[PDB]
């Protein structure tokens, strides 16, 4: 029963692109720590400017990223968000809005997030942030 849920969560995580660098211990912590929630269409999962404590992974549906009234992108299944506030100890840099009903996210707190990214995952997260900031900066020149 608990073994079933462990089995299922391990099976899914082992398949996921973003978690491909997890050590066995990091994977164990993630399986034990994550929780899930469902959002309705239009729900603000994250609001820009607020303190954040959670890292999110989309398991169903799509979300919109909006910053200063500008749409930045749409994220989908097996994408993550909410990493910037936790990495840099800063308020949320953008809002994240559920685009449809029944969007489901997994999430872990900051302590778990910091522990499970150690290794190659950290460097990949920071690289993506750099590229994102670069394109947004150039996009805004128009
Ligand atoms: N500032 C910013 N955040 C983004 C972008 N794309 C998706 N996001 C996510 O939106 C989130 C806002 O909360 P965080 O700042 O903690 O982390 C952010 C990211 O994970 C982007 O191009 N710029």
UniProtKB/Swiss-Prot annotation:
Maturation and modification: Autophosphorylated.
**Superkingdom of the source?**
Eukaryota
Where does the chain bind 3',5'-cyclic GMP 2? 73, 82-83, 85, 92-93
> Where does it localize?
Cytoplasm; Endoplasmic reticulum membrane
- Site note Part of a catalytic triad required for cGMP binding and cGMP-dependent kinase activity, residues: 84, 132-133
For region cNMP-binding domain 4, the annotated ranges are 18-117
Domain notes, please? The cNMP-binding domains 1, 2 and 4 bind preferentially cGMP. The cNMP-binding domain 4 binds cGMP with the highest affinity and is highly selective for cGMP. The cNMP-binding domain 3 does not bind cGMP but is required for cGMP-dependent catalytic activity. The cNMP-binding domains 1, 2 and 4 can bind cAMP but with less affinity. The autoinhibitory segment (AIS) interacts with the active site and inhibits catalytic activity.
Role this protein plays:
Serine/threonine protein kinase which acts as a downstream effector of the second messenger cGMP. Controls the release of Ca(2+) from intracellular stores by regulating phosphoinositide biosynthesis. Ca(2+) signals are essential for merozoite and sporozoite invasion and egress from host hepatocytes and erythrocytes, and, in the mosquito vector, for gametocyte activation, and ookinete and sporozoite motility. During the host liver stage, regulates the initial invasion of host hepatocytes by sporozoites by regulating sporozoite motility and microneme exocytosis.
What family does the Swiss-Prot or TrEMBL record give for this protein?
A: Belongs to the protein kinase superfamily. AGC Ser/Thr protein kinase family. cGMP subfamily.
Subunit text: Monomer.
What's the protein name? cGMP-dependent protein kinase
| Species per Swiss-Prot/TrEMBL record | Plasmodium falciparum (isolate NF54)
